[PDB]
Amino acid sequence: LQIPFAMQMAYRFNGIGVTQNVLYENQKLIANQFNSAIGKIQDSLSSTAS
């Protein structure tokens, strides 16, 4: 069933007991923290095989 990704994340916030409006009011920050965090995965796996 399709659902907009910002609304799928609002359901997933609401599932950990954080109210939906915490996402919609912080959506740019939450997206920046996510894009940054995947950038660290890419750097770590390039930096070391270990």
């Binding site: 907009p4 910002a6 609304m7 359901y11 109210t19 409006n21 919609y24 009011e25 959506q27 740019k28």
Partner: protein
């Protein structure tokens, strides 16, 4: 507890796993802040069930 949904002309709130449209009201919803913050918000009346009772 639900999702906002439109049939193409009206707006309703429904539970997420079975289509059950309700009128949007001050019970079905909660406020947080002003209209300007949320990315992709829309405009509708929200019915307040007390107001017709204060009309008597």
């Amino acid at each position: 507890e639900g999702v906002f949904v439109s049939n193409g002309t009206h707006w309703f709130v429904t539970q997420r796993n079975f289509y059950e449209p309700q009128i949007i009201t001050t019970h079905n919803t909660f406020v947080s802040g002003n209209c300007d913050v949320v990315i992709g918000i829309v405009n509708n009346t929200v019915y307040d069930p007390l107001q017709p009772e204060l009309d008597s």
